[model samples]
Structure formats: structure tokens, C-alpha cells
Target chain A: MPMQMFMQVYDEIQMFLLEELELKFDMDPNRVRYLRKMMDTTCLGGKYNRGLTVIDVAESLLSLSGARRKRVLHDACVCGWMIEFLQAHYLVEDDIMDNSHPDVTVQCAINDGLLLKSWTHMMAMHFFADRPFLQDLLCRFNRVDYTTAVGQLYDVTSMFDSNDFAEFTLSNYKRIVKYKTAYYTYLLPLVMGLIVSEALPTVDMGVTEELAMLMGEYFQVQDDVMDCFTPPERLGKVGTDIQDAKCSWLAVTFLAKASSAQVAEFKANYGSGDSEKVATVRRLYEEADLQGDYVAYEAAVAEQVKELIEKLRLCSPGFAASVETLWGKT
Target chain B: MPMQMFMQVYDEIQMFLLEELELKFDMDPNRVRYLRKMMDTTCLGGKYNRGLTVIDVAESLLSLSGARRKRVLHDACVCGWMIEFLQAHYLVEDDIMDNSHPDVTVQCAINDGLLLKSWTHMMAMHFFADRPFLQDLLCRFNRVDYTTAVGQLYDVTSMFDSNDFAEFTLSNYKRIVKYKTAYYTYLLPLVMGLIVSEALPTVDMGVTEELAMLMGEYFQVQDDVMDCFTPPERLGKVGTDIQDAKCSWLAVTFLAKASSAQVAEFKANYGSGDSEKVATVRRLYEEADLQGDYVAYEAAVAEQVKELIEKLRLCSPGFAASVETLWGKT
Candidate 1:
């Protein structure tokens, strides 16, 4: 039922983009049409589990009339959809910057078309502008946008200052994850849902915000682990963060443990976008026992999550459940 | 005195970008520093007359008092700076898209060593976000942004669609100018000034919006004419818009009157970015008696300005003086 509601909202937003916004890709009509199709497919492809958890947990926490509960359910769905939209914005821009091909089942911006790249930002802006509750949504949108831009800048500037790569500690890796992926993917949706349901005040919104941010950190670390190990078919792309020279948690960890010769080899070969470079890095990870370290790190993070969940449980079982569900999935 | 005030505001805004912003580029950092410096210099190099005109004209219309009037003046200056910012955004993106070499006073974005063009948009977004008054400014900024983007889309789309070039009629030219350059450069600053002074409700803001838009059209047409006739040194750039394949008003008028061989000659030479092509187009314009047409066109436009000024005189003499001061300088 929750997935059905999510689909309906998603469809409505897509229809608004295509029909009402009048965003025709005038440069190359066929390419524009393909991009619109890709956007539609990407929205549907995400796991609807986060959305379902929102409703399931909210209903269990609060006793309310039918109308009020329906509102909460609808808000949860909207929050779920927003997370997908945030991902769409990041992926669209990242694909262009990284020179990556095949995003959301279509050729990436430079390969397929330039108009698609230009229009992606326009579509993102229009999506928010077209909403009736613009003030609330725009404020949330702007905050997420500001943080993401700062994260992207940090990533770019880090390349120039070689000391940034040298000082790539686990703590710094977590900070990057917090700014880059965690905020929009995990924390924003939950906070937005609470805002929509007007449940924030009752639970002390600041505390909830802090709790969700910590959960967001845990969620991104799990993603980094999965990226290094997940099969291509499951993840939809080869794990190329190291090859792409991205500031990922895995890269930071590898740098900390590898020998001087290993570090030199990793720097020269990694991000060469070659098969041998990828295999060489993977072998170095195994030789250095970094994979075992990653496993142990995951267990320690799980213990921290348990402790945080217990702390949240004391204040509000509902918020704790939302956080716990995210942790459990990881 | 008015120019001094405008210069002061312009310097302050530039300082805000260089000093107060998180990523102020220093002179000696590296190649990225050079690129950042170039971007900032190009952004700050504009005349700033269009922005100042809005404040000058608005102050003439109303007898504002105390700190309220001062705030209106400040808002007008900011809106003017935003107009310049909008132009900078377009130029940076257009430079990359068109592969042009020079933009304003410096090398274009691609030649200036910037990695990705999307970073320019991020820069623009950052400028708006860092200011607390951005929400209020967005009410006007969004409208200008949407209209200018539509105009840019039309300009880019028109290039590939037709070769007749006669389709670039005066009405079409007016439509492009009104949306692209007029709204942000003229209407936004003027109306925003009125709103800040709390005079908009009393004076009927919609009428003011219309008047400022017409003035903006006049300003752009004059600018296009100046580009064609002004000496290369006086114009600041050697080739200006004519060498860049831009659909300027002067080029369209020549296309409207030229014969078959002449039209082909004009098309081959005018937008080709080759110096010989530019000279050939200019020679054809002179031979086709388009120079005489331009003189008459300028005279007629000047008369329209006279009428607009007369209308302003009857409605508000102070506003009339402001409009007169702007035109008198040119």
C-alpha cells in the first residue's frame, strides 16, 4: 500500500515536469525525450523501503484520528520522494563532472547530449518552484543544496592541496560522508517527514535532527562498505570510486595502512580507469588485511548505532524506531 | 555623484565575493587560483550603469525619507549587481558552449582552466545563498532567471533550426531582449527599489514593471548599435558580439534587407568568427544601404525614448530626470 502511494506521488511529479513545465529539449528533441524517460525510470528504481518505514513507524508511535494519520502517511510519502529527487540532482551533476557514462539507464550527459545536462538543473529548479507549499519545500531544498555544494567544493579543492589526501583519516572520511551523501539521503527525509507531520515540536526537533544526522553517518559508512564488495549486477555499476579518484572511506583507510611503495603504486595506478589498476588496488587491499579491518570497523559502527538507538529510545520510541530501521537495513 | 555611489556598491559586492566568501582566491596559490581570479575579474568588469539606472529613476518618482530611503538605494544597487551577475553567468556558460576565447575582460571559462562549466552555476548559487536577504531577493530573481533561460534556450535553438535568417524579425528580437536582458537589468532593480521603499503599493508596481521593461529594451538596442559603430578600443573588445555568432539587432536588420547572394555572403562571413568574414559582412551592410537604415532606426528609437521620457514627465517628473540622466550619458 505504501509503495502504491509512493508511485502515485512520483508519477504526479513526473507528469508535472513533462506536461506543465513545458521543458522541451529544443537542441536535440530525441535526446531530451530520452533524458525525460531516464528521469522517470530512476525515480521508480529506488528501493521504496525508506518510505514504507516512515509510515509504519509513524503509525505505531502516535494515536490519532483517521484524517490526521492520513496526513502523516502522505507527508511520509512526500519525504520519501524528496530523497529520490535529491539523489537525481547529485547523480546528474556527478555524471557530467566525473565523465561517467550510463546513468539511470542512459548515456551520460557529455556522451549522449549537452542539452540534457543543462536541462537537468532547470528541471530540478522547476520541480521545487511548481510546488504549492514552496516556502517550506524551498527552505529545505536550499539547505540540502548548500550543504551538497560545499561538499562538492571540498572534494574538488582537496585534489589541489595534496596534504588533503595525505591527511585522509577515518574521522575526515566520516565528515566527507556526512556532508556529501548522508545529509540528503538519510537525515533530510526523516527531518522533512517530521516537519510535514508537525511532530517535530513534540519530540524536540533539534534532538531529532542530531539523532538523524548520526544515523545518516552510519548509513553512508555501510554504503562505502557495500560499494567495495557488492557485485556489479546488484549495485548497477562496477565499484570505481577508487578508480575515479573519489575521496571515499575505502581510499582513506587504504592510505592509512599501505606501505610507502604501496602508496606510490596506488597513487600512480589508481584512477587510471584501467582494469589492471583496479585489480592492483584490490590485491593491495587484501595483502594489507584492509578487508578484515573494514569488517571489524563495521562491527564497531554497529555497536555505536545500538548505543545511539537506546539513547533515542529514552526520549521517543518513534524516532528511535525510524533510526533503528535504517541501521537494521544496513 | 550617482556613478560614485554605484561604484561604491559595486566595490563592496566584489569585496564580499573576494573576502567574506569561504573560497576567496588568493593571487599566489596555483593554477586554480589564477582561474578563480579570472572568473572574479570578468564578473566585476561590467559598466554597472544598468543597475544604477534603476535606483536613479526610482528615487525621482518618490519622496522617500530616513533609513527607509537608504535601504531602497541599497536594494537597487544589489539588484543592479545581480543583473551584472546574471550576465556573468550567461557569458561563462556561453563561452564554454560556443568555444569563444575572451569574455568581458579575461579569458573565457574553458580557456581560464576551470574543469567543469557547472561550477559556474554553483558559484552563482553560492552568491545568493550566503546572503540572508536572498529569500526576498529570490521573489524577483527567480522571475528574471526563468525568463533569461527561456530566451537563451530560444537563441541556442534558433541557430540550428533555420538558415533564412530573415526569420529573426524585429518583434522576435524585441521578445528576446525583453526576456533576456530587460527584466533583470531594468525591471528587477527598479521594481525592487520601489518595493524596498514601500512605495510600490501606492504607485501601482505593475505599471512600474512595464515601464522599466520598456526602458531595458531601449538600453539593449542602444548597446547593440554601439557595438556595431563604436571604435574597437572604445568598445573594450575588438570584435564584441558580432564576431561571436550572437543574433544581435544590427545583424538581423542587415539580413532583412540583403539580396540572395548578399544574404549568403552575410551568413558565411558574419557569424563565422573569422576577421575576414566580419569585414565582408560590414562591407555588405554598407553597400546594401543598411547603414542609412541604421541611422533612421537609431533616430526612431531616440524618438521613442523621447516619448517615454515625456510620459514619465507627466506621471512623475523625478522619474523622468532619472531616465534622461541614463540616456544622456550615452
Candidate 2:
């Protein structure tokens, strides 16, 4: 139910962002095309669990009939899109040292400056721009971005530190996933909905965090599976976790389970960008029935997440339905 | 007066930033060193005209004797330090895609982020987190960063197209100067004073841009002279705008005055990182009497700027005297 609802809203959110871009920039066709392409390739490309969570939570909180209610939903949608821009920036910069669409990373750092600033622009135009919790909203967004940057720096540093496979601990795997993706992807949207819902002061922020981190665990594990199992067209993106020898869920499990000799072989072959190398890593997983293990893990977490969501009985029906859309239900 | 006042505050500002870093991040010692080094090497290590100007302007705007006055002065000092972090980010990032020290470039950006985010952390702890303009203040900071980033992109792309030096017109230079440095360095700090002063609703922003851009032009022109004239030690920074093929005041003026043959020679010898090449390029300026010309131009613009400041003559006395301290007065 959440997936279908989110998809419809997602389509609208993309257009809303475009419209805002045009209205704000007085954008000519060239710039319009440029910005739209940047958004399409980067912002709108993700599955957008975060964005969906926002819409879902908002739907639950609002009366759904008032004009002001619709305006707020759209505002939540804009905020969701704002986060997508943040992800888009992370994805592109992750792919390369700097970026494309913008001149260079330094300039991208500048061009990229707009994404967060626009989030500000989003806030500035909001009725809540005059509210007390507004700084909380603005400060939280930046702190989230700061956290993302720091985590990304941590992630990238490990890439350079890749000579030691042993150093990539199971704990770091979770921390990286949570910091790099979960905070912004799940918790951010959840809190954003609360920010709009006026239930911010009531909600214990930690409640949403446990939900996000758990979901993020499944989310990252799912990414490991999708990268190996899903083809390019199905995934709608390229996959390189194995070829890059990332500290993925699969990698953690494989490292823990593999014999020391196998580990040596895995370390030598992984991250080489060779198809044969990636294939060999996959064979090891199949031999270990890692796929079976993932399914079991997925089923277990989905139930736990649902039970948790039911217990909190979130201020929004949309949020529960939204949480159920991924993993075991899917 | 501005320099002496800022000098006394510099060590404390550096320490204040460190103290804040400790309060904000339970950063591990190594990361602590990394961030502080990033701040000290980039932010505090500058000639700090922008920092000084901000203090000077703020000093003029507020009363000087009471506790509130001291608090405002402290806040002004913090704002000045904040701009320094922005420059420091640019300084390192400019030199070999990373940095050390600086003269003023208006800011080219307050492109740095953590410094600004730390400011948010500051406000989050502040008792006034409840105010409406708090978001206004936070949102405006990111927006200013966004504008700086956009301008930097414009300046960099033109560097790759050095063949058409004509396209590097006066307006292009001015726009680059305005975007890269003026917005954050001068304009931002001015508005920051307004923000701190609680005069956000009353002050005209365009006034600051005019003053900042004009000052930025002089600031940059002085930088061009410093690279050629100031010894590496006294300058406390190396001059590489020549080797870097920067769209500097010197480059723009040389292209404007030189003939086709001289330009061809200039292009080949310039940005080669050869000291001899650097000296030859210096000879062209010698032939053109650029030093004398610069002195004449300096006096002319200083008077023009002085006259302009007198006209705007700001509500603050420190601002007028502050602007005089940049070049010949130094």
C-alpha cells in the first residue's frame, strides 16, 4: 500500500522539484534541461524509502481535507526531494573524486552548495520559517549532511586503507551503513514528517533511529543481494560492491564464515573489477548458501520492524504501511 | 586598528573553535587533529582582511561598553572566524586541489561546511533557538554558501578557456570576483552583523554587495601584487596564481594591455611553474609599467572606494577607517 502510494507521490514530487527549479531560476530551456537531467540522474534515481516515509507519516498526521493540509503534504514532498538532492550529490561524488553536471568537485562543492541551500530555500518559504523549531529543522538538516560527509570520508578512507581486510570489522559495517545511508535515508524523512506534524516535541527521536538502523541493516543487506542478484535493468543502476570490495553485509558474513585460506584467496581477488573475480566471489557465497541466510535474516528483521512499528503506533498510518513496503512483504 | 583588534582575538577564536569542536564531536584524537589542522591551516592562517572588515563594521554598529556590547563583539569575532574557515577551505582546495594559507579573495566562497555547521551547533545550544530569524539566519548562511559555489564554478570554467582572453572581460572578472569572494567575504559578514544586530529586516543587502565587490577588486589586485612583490616569508604564503593560470587581476590587466605577440608570449611562458618563466612574465609588466600603473590605479580606486564608502559612509565609523587599511595604508 505504501509503495503504490509513494510511487504516485514520487512522480509528483519529481515534477514539483522541476517546477520549483523553473520558478526559482526563471530558468531558460538550457538551464532547465541541465537541472532536470541532474535531478533525474541523481535525485530521482533512488528507491526513496526516505521520501516515502515522509509522505506516509504526513498522510497519517493530517486531516487530509483542509487546503492547508494539502499544502503541507506538498511541502513534505519538497523536503523529500531536497534529501534526494543530497543523495544524488553523494552518489555522484562517490562514483568519482568530484562530479559532473557541475564544473568540478570544488565547484560541485559550490554547485552542490545549492542542494542544502535549497533545503534552506524550502524552509525559508515555509510558514514554519517563522516557527521556533525552525532552527532545529535547519540545523538538523546541516548536521545530517555534516554527518554524511564525515561518514563518507570514513568510508572513502577505508577504501584507501583496503590493504587490510581484517580491519573492516562487522561493527564498522553497521556504523558505515547507518551513518552513510540510514541517518538521511530513513531517520531524516521520519523526523521531517514529525517536524511538519507538530509532534516533534512529543516524539522521542531515538525511536525512529532504532527503526531506521534496523531498516538500514536490512536496507544495506538488501543492497548486497541486489548488487549481486539483480541485473542492471532491474536495479536501474550499476553495481560494483564486489568489484570494489566494499565492506558489505555479504562481505562481513563471508569473511566470518570463510576458511582462512579462502579468505586469503578472497582478499587477493576481490575489488579487481574483473568479471571472473566477481564471479568467483559469488560462487563462494552460493557454496555457503548465503542467499538462504539472507532470506532468513530478511524475514526475521521484517517481522521485528513491523512489530516495532505496531508498538510505537506511529502518529501516521502511512509510516507503518511505508515500513512494510520493503523486505519481507516485498 | 582593525588588524590590531583582530590580532588580539585570533588566538582565542582559534581556541574557541577547538573548544566548540570538542563540545560538538566526540571526535577521536586523530580526527580531532585532522579537523583542527583543517581549521588552523585553512581558516586562521590568512591575512584576514575579510575577517578584519567584518569586525570593523560590527564594532561600528553596536555599543562598546556594556556586557551586551562585549557579547556582540565576541559574536562579531566569531563571525569573522567563520568567514576565515570559508576562505581556508578555498585556500587549501585552491592550492593543489587542497590548502595552507591565504590573502583575501572576498571568500571565493565560504565554501567550507563544518565551520558553518558548527555555527549551527552553537545556535542549537543558544537560548534563542526559539526565534524565527534563527532559521532565517541558518537558511541565509547556506544560501550564501550556495551563491559562492555557483560563482566559483563560473570562474573555473573560464580558466580552461584561456585562449579567448577577450571573453575574460572586465565584467567577467568582476562577476567572478563578486561571486567567488564578495558574497561571503564582504557581503555575508556585513549581513551577519545585521543578523547579530537584529537589523536583518532593516538593512539593504545591495549596499553590502557594492561595498564588498569594490573592496574585493582591491583585495584581489593587492593579491596579484603580493605574489610578485612580497617575499614568501613576509607574505606568509606563496604566490602561485601565475603558475596556476588563475584569472587574476594581473592576468586580466596584462591581457588587456598586451599586443597579440606579447599575449602569445605571455600565454606560453605563463602558468609553466618555471621561475624563469615567472620572471619573464614579470618583465612584460615591467615593460608595461604595471607597478607604477598599479600604484596609480590603487590610489585612484582607494580614493574612489573611499568616496563611495563616504557616500554609503555606513552607519558605522569603524567601517570607513577599516576599508582604508587594505593596501597603501598597510
Candidate 3:
């Protein structure tokens, strides 16, 4: 029932942004045709679970009528989709930056048959321009965007500056996750709902923000754990983020515990793209007892998330239930 | 006086959009800071000549005063800058797609320490989203964006296809230019001004569309001509289109008239990135009598444009003056 409501809202917002608003540009007929094709290929699919989560929460908290409910649902879904959109924005840029050969199940920008992958970034922005409330929404959205960009910039810069290694401690890793993925993925959608539904008076925005940040950190760490162990079909790539030298939670945790020789071995293999290097690093991570550490950490984070949920549930049981449904836990 | 009015109007729109409307996005501070630098570098220096040209033309047509005049003038300049903004959009993408080393007198995306030039594309869209009237001003902007993407796709695909040298004709060249450059640079801005100024009646929309398209073609041809013969500083890049093996107007015209051996020579030199090859193509262009052909063709096109302008002038002197200023001759 939660998923159905979430999807219904998702489709409506997608329709309004993608079709109803008519925000496309005029160019060659052939080029226009291809962009529509590219849009379809890139924009659709994704767990869409994150976006739907917001709608689930919204429905449970508000006793909205059909029209009002539809509006709130649409905004919730739009906010949710914005997370995916933010991901797409980051992925497109990251694909170019990392020189990844494939992106989101298709060819990367350089390898993709298109010369102007840069233009795809513009198309993503146009997708949001259809809403009458776009200005306010975008102002909020920009904060999330800016935070994420900063996280990415720091991550890239950290690659060249080893002095920052100490700074990449567990706390810093949480900070990066909070800034990069957490704000856009978790906080933005919930806050957007709060704003749109006029539920701000009823909810503690600061507490929600903190809780969402923790949730985002927890989510990303789990993603890192999944990358190390999840099946290729489930994760969608073989040895993906590791091969990319992403400053993921695993890397930071391993670095903290690895011996000097192990550190040397890890650095040598880091981002080398050699299967042997990856295997050696994976071996070192296991030898350092990092996998056990990750397991424990995941359990602790899950507990913390549950505690946060309990706190929210105290404020409103419906909100807690909605969040769980959105996360697909219930 | 004309330049002052242009600046005044330009400043007004900038202030309105950036300050009053608070339409700016919170960009990724680190990466977007550079992107913002690039936007400033690329969009600000274009002589403001194109925008001023529109104003000069509009003033000649209307003897209006106060808020209405300011609004029209502001709209014209905004459209003018929007065209410039579109160029910046393309250049940012082109720098990435073409793998060019520099853009707008600075290092290109890869050179600018950016992870992906693609991010700049999103920056452009973000910039546009701030304008509330953007959708109403140019309904076809999105279409133009898509079409340009398709043209770029064809361009990228053509690189690997290795088609016959003789097959590249003026028609194909014109079609590519119409999508890749002309529509955004010429037709959209003119049509935007026409719509905003209410110079075109609802009934005359069809005719205006046709006329705007023709003007687009003419403007692009002029740009192509300028690319070939204009001095390095005046043309912005030194033999830019030639270096890229762009299916430009000059190349098409030369191909139309070149002997078989000359065509083969042109093909051999195409996209070689060798300065001598560029020179060789330049020599071939001279030998094929392209300069004379271009001159005659430009004159004829200019005459046709003038005729069209006269018809449009009958409807509103404001639009006529705009055209005269855009063409720089009346």
C-alpha cells in the first residue's frame, strides 16, 4: 500500500516535470529525437525507493483531502526525485572525472555516442523549471547541491594531498557522508515535505535534520558494505567503487587500522585498476580485521537509526511508520 | 547613448534576476566556484554588442517612455544575454566534447582542474532556472537544447563512420549548423523579443517562425564566413572551426566547388590537428574560389534578410530596428 501510494505520486510529479510543463528547447528535429531517447534511458528507473520514502511519510502524517493530498504527494515525490536527479547530476560529472567507462547502466559521457554530456546536466535543471514554486524549491535544492559538490571536491583534492589522510578519520568520513550524500538524499526530501505540507510548526526541523543526516551516513556505510560483498547484479557493477578509489567508508576504516606495511600495500593498489591490486587490498582489509569491524559498525548504526526512529515515533507514530515503509523495512 | 541604454537595461535585468528575485542557485562552492568563474569569463565579455544591437533597433522603432519602454528594453537585452548565455552553454559542452584545451580565453574543463566539464552544462541550466519568464519567452529553448544534442550526437557518430568525402554537402552542412548553432543564436532570441514585445500577433506566429528560421540560417552563414577569414583576435579562437574539422559553411562551400583531388586532400587533412593541414585546407579554399562564392552568397542572403525585415517592419518599427542593429546595416 505504501509503495503504491509512493509510485502514484512519483508518476504524477514526473509527468508534470517531464511532460506537462514543456520546458524543452528547440534544435534540430533529429537531435530533439535523440535527447528524448537519452532522457528516457537516463531518467527512469533507480530504486526510486528514496523518493517514495518521502511520500510514505507525508501520507501517514497528514489527513489530506484528494486535491490537497495530490499536491502534497506530488511535492513529496518531486523532492524525492530530486534526490535521484542530484545523483544523476553527480554521476554524470563523476563519470567524466573518474573516466569511468559506463554510467548508470549505459556508456559514460566520453564513451557514450554523445559529444556533449555537459548538455545533459542542463537538461536535468530544465526538468525542474516546470513548477510554479520552482524558485523556492530550487533555493532549498541549491543548498543540498552545493554541499554535495563540496564533498566531491574535498574527496578529489584529498587524493592528491596525503596530509589530509589523518583528517579522513571515522568522524571525518561521517562528515563527508553527511555533507555529500546525507543532505540531498535524506534531509532535503523530508524538509521539503515539512515546508510544503506546512508541518514545520508541528515538527522539530533541527531534530529531523540531525536524524536524517545520521540515516544518510548509515545508508552510505551500508552501501559500502554492500559493494564489498553484494552480488554483481544487486550492486550493478563488479568491484565498482573500490576500483574507482572512492573515499568510501571502507577505505577510511581500513586505513585507520591497517599496519604500516599494509598501508603501503593498500596505497600501491589503491585506484590501480588491476584485478590483482584490488584482490590484494581486499585481502589486506580482511587481514586487518576490517570486515568484522564493518559488521559491528553497521549493527551499531542500525541501532542508532532505530533509536532515532523511536524519538520521531514519540512525536508522531504515523511519521515513524511512514519512514519505515519508505525505507522498505516494513 | 545607445551603449549606455544597453548597459542600463542589462544592469536592470541582472539586478532583477540576481538580487530582487534571488534567482541564483547555491552552487557547489569549490567546483561551481570555478564554473562560476568560467561563466563570468565566457558570458560577460561578448561586447554586449548583440544585446545592445537589439536595443538600438527597438528604440528606433518606438518613441515610448517610462516603465513600458524599460520593460521592452529590459526584455530585449535579457534575450540578447540569453543568446550569449546559450553560447557559453555550448562552449562549456564543446570544450568537453571536442576535448579542446581552452575556452573563452581560459583553460577548458579538463585543463581548469575540473573533474568533469559536464558540470558546467548543469550550471547553465541552473542559471536559466532563475528566470520566471524563461519558459514563456522561448517555448522552443528546450527543443533547441535537444536538437543541439542530436546534432552533437551525429557529429560524434560521424567521427567514427568514415563516410565518403564527396557525400558531405551544403545541405547537410546547413542542417548541422541550423541545429548546432543557428537556432539558439539567431531564431530563438529574435522570436523571444518578438513574443515579449507583443510585436507578433497570434495569427502571424507561423510566418514569424519561418522568418526567424531563415534569419538563423543567414546568421550562421555569416558566422562561418567570419570563422574562415576573420583575424585571430577578432574571431576569438585561432582557426577554431577548422581545427575541429567542423562541417562548417566554408568547408562545405569549398567542397561544393573543389576538384576531386582537392576534395581528397581536404579529407586527408580533416581533423589531423596539424597546423599545416589547416593551412592546406585554407589554401584549398582559396583555390576553389570559395571567397568569391561566399561573398556573392552572403550578399544575396543579406538582401533576402532585408526584404524580410521590411515586411516585419510594417508590423512594428521596434522589430525592424532590432533587425537592423542585429544585421549592423540598414
Candidate 4:
């Protein structure tokens, strides 16, 4: 039933958009079929933890029951799906950015990414036209869109100067994580839930924003740590932070903790395309006990976020509940 | 003075967005410089004809002529630039799709295109937030966006089976042109002008829609004909429709009119990657007097559109004026 509600929302949006496209432009049946297949393949995967958080948070915040409850939940689902649309578009472009192997051609993928991006605002216009928060909702989506792009730009350009270890400082790495992964990943859905529930009346966004960023940072560090310690078979994809010269949390933490000699050795092997150089880099990472450092960082962050949640819970249990949904994600 | 007004709007938006990015994300000075360069290269070129049309149409429609007029013109320019932003994003992606040689790497270009797309809705949100038409205005942008992508998808996939002469039908070609080129090019700016000026009360969009579509068709056919006839020095780029097996108007028109023997020869040489085969295709086009056919087609379309404009001129002169600005561009 949990999955069933999300699927109902997805099916409605999928059918509505497809039908609207045909009505708007007289799309050929063949073209419609291609779009359907493309949407299903690119948009319908993942555990939908982020999107579901939107629904769950909105439900927790709202006091409505009966017809209004059903209606609001569906609206929150629409809001949740907007994040999914946003994520789908980003993943498509991120694939192209990283030159990852993709199922579709790059050319088709570029257009597909664009089509997905447009769907976010299209959903806003269609579903939220009468809502008081229409303009604000769109602006939030736009702001995040711009912020995420800026983060991506930072992420991409940071790698270009990866050989200069000074460029990979903890502060800079945190900036990248906050902009690239944190806001969109945690803050966007969290705020979206608040806005949809109209529960911002007593809530202080400054605190919520801070908590969201912390959670995002927490989540991303896990990814960086997981990349190094976990196998691709279990993770579903290989991590290439060492080879790609990514400004990762693991690498930044290592630089902060390791001695000068270890840092020198690490610099020589990092960011190289050679497999041997990458292997050496990985070995150095292990030697530095980065895994232990990650655990310590995670514990510290968990304590930090719990305090944040406690503060927010005093004012609004809904916001606190939403953060827990994200925090508890597998 | 005319260029002065347009530049004022451009400079303001550039500063606002750049400053907002920095303030919102704490972007580095170096990153700001990169975005400025990218925006200038991709979004700031062209004749500014389409964007300028929005300002022109809005001014022509507005009854106010004092301080209100000046304010409206500035607002109109913002509306105009939105079209510019929309066009910029499309061009960036189209470059990737066609594998057109671009100054930036394909990876960077994909992200750059996305950034540009995001700016369209951002501008709408920022500039039109208080306006009554905010939702409708955003919806129009979203509609054009989806239509253009569908058109692009049709255009790209049609070429995949270019060897099938049956696939390049005039009906299909018009669908590509209307969805891809017509709506955004003529109708979008025209409608934007009307909405900005509060002239929709007096205007019937059905008539405006028809005229815009006709003009777009008229403009696109000129492009198809020009590609076959115009030199690269004169036209700015070499035409490759025959070699690329594009479902162009010329090819579709030829199929309708050419004798069976000519059709066979045309099909044999069309869509071939070889240089000589493309040359033969060009020779056949010239032999068939496609240029003369184009002249006749142009006159017929011009007459039809003149009648369309006449119908529109009665309900609202501002739209007709806007259409003329587009029609008059060199």
C-alpha cells in the first residue's frame, strides 16, 4: 500500500503528460511510444526514498482527514513526483557529464534530459495553478535548479585542478557537497513537503535549512565512504573518485588527518588515468584508515543532526518527522 | 537608442542572476567568470530579432505613453529575453544532437544547456511574480518547451530511416516544422507580447495561433530552400540535409512532384554518406527547378499570411506589428 500510493500518482502524471503532449502537438503514435518507453526507463527506477519523504512529511504536517486528507496526500505525491522528475533530468545529464555508459545515444539523451526538466514546471503549472504557493513553489524549483547546476559546475571544475591538492581542501569539498548534493537531495524535498502542507506558519526555515544541509552532507559522505569500502556488485556501480580526482569527503578527510609524507605519496598517484596509479591511491586511502575516520565523522554528524531535530521538534513535529524519514533511509 | 533599451535589460538580468548565484551558493569569482563567458557566447549572439519582437509588440499594444510606457518597455524586454533564453538552450542541445562542432566539450555543453533552460523559468519567476498572468505565462513557456522537444525527437528519429522514401512525407515534415520551429519562433513571442501588454482581452488567440503557425511554416520552408541554394559564406553554414538524409521540405516536395524515374534516382543518391552521392542529389534538385518551385511556394504562403495578418490586424494591431517585426528581419 505504501508503494501503491506512489505508483498511483506516477501513473496519473505519466498518462496526463502523454495525453497532453499528443493534444498539444498532435504527436504521432510512433513518437508517443518512444517517449513512453523513454520516460519509463529513465524515471521509474530507484527506491524513491526522496520522493516518498515528500509524501510522508506532508502527511505528518497536515491535520486534515477524510476527503481533504486523501486530496492533500495526492497533491503531496505530485510534489514528490516533481523531485523525481528533477532527479531524472539530473541523472541523465550527469551520465553525459561523467561520460558513463548509457542505454540511449548521447544526442537522444540530451533531448530526453531536457524533456524531463520541463516536466517539473509543467507539473507545477498543471497541478498547482490554483494554489496560493504557485509562484513560490516554482521559484523554489528554479532556485534549486540553478543551485544544483552551480554545484555541478563546481564539482566538474574542481576535478580539473585535482593535482593541486590545495584545491581539494575540506571547506571547498563541503561547498561542493552542499551545493551539488545537499540542497537538492535533502533541503528541496524537505521544504517542498513543508510548503505543500502549508505548515510554514510557525516553522523557522533557517533551522530547517541548516538541518537539511547537515543531512545532505551526512548522506554524501556515506556515498564517498561506500565507494571506497563496498564492492560494485553490492553497490550496483563502481566508484571512481580516486581515478576521477573527485573532491570527495574521504579524500578531504584523509588530507586533514594524514602526515606530510603520506600526503605526498597520495598526491603522486591520485587523479591519474593509469590503473596502477589508482590502485596505489586506493592502498594509501586504506593505509590512512579512512574507514575509521568515516565512522567517527558519521557518529559526530548523527549527534549533530539529532540536536537539530530536537530543536525543530519543539516547534513542528512534522518537519522533525520528515527529517527522520530521510535519516532512516537504507 | 533601440539597441540601448535591449542592452539595458540584458545587463540587468545578467547582473541579477550572476549576483544571485554567488549570494545563494557562495560561488567562486573564477566560476562567475566562466558563466559570464558561456552566457555571452551562447545567449547573447544572433540579431536579437526574436527577443526584440517581444518589446516591439508590447510597446505597440500598450495604450499608456508616459512613465507607464517606459516601465512596460523594460518589462517587455525581460519577456523578450525569456525567448532568447529559451532559444539559447535549444541551440545548445541541438548542437549536441547533430554532433555539431561546438567550442565547449560535449559534457560541459550538456550542463551549460541545462543552466540556460533553467534561466527561462527563473526569469519568469523573478520578473513576473506579481503579475496576474504568472501561472499562464510559465505554462506557455513550458508548453513551447515540450513541443520543441517533441519536434526535435520527430526530426531526429525521422532521419534514422531516411533511406525509406516513404517516411519523408510533407505531413510529417510540417509536423516537425510546426512543433519544432513554428510555435516557439512566431507564436511564442507574439503571444508573449499580447499577454505582457494586457491586450489579450481584445485578442482572440485562435486567430493569432493560426497566423503564427502559418508564418512559422512560411519561415521554415524558406530555411529548407535556403539550405539547398545558399552558399556557406552567405548563409553562415553549409547545408547537409541531403547527406544527413533529413526529412526536409525540399525532399518531400520533390517526392510529391518528381516523375517515377527521377524519384528512383533521387532515392538512390539521397542519404548516402559519400560526397559524390550528395552532389548528385543536389544536381537533381537543381535540375527539377526546386528553386523556382520555392519561389512559387513563397508567394502563395506570403499571400496566405498577409490574409492572416489582415484578420489579426482588426482585433489587435500590436500582434500584427510584432509579426511584421519578425517578418522584416534580415
The best-first sequence of candidates by TM-score reads 4, 2, 1, 3
* TM-score for each candidate, following the candidate numbering: 0.75, 0.78, 0.68, 0.95
- Candidate with the greatest DockQ versus the true structure: 4
lDDT of 3 by residue, A51-156 (tens): 6666766777675316767766666665666665556555555556444210212222533323223232333345445555544554565556655655554555
What's candidate 3's DockQ score? 0.12
lDDT of each: 0.57, 0.63, 0.58, 0.79
- lDDT: which is higher, 3 or 4? 4
In angstroms, how far off is B37's CA in candidate 4? 1.2
Instruction: For model 4, state the Cα shift of residue B11 in Å.
Output: 1.1
Per-residue accuracy of model 2 over B1-330 as CA lDDT, tens digit each? 656666666666556555654565433455456655555555554577666656665666674217767666666666666666566555544442343111112121132343444443453334234544465566666666656655665566555531135545667777777777777876777776666656555543455457677877777778778887788999977777776666777788888899999999998887667889988888887897788778876677677676776644455444444445533333
- Tens digits of per-residue lDDT for model 3 on B134-195? 44443355455555654555444433331134436677666666666555655565666654
Residue A54, candidate 4: alpha-carbon lDDT = 83
lDDT of 4 by residue, A36-131 (tens): 888888889888877888888878877531766776678789988999888999999876655531122666877788789888877778888788
Q: After superposing candidate 4 on the true structure, give the runs of residues whose Cα lies further than 4 Å from its correct spot.
A: A63-65, A98-104, A161-163, B63-65, B98-104, B161-163
Clashes per candidate (backbone, < 3 Å): 0, 9, 14, 0
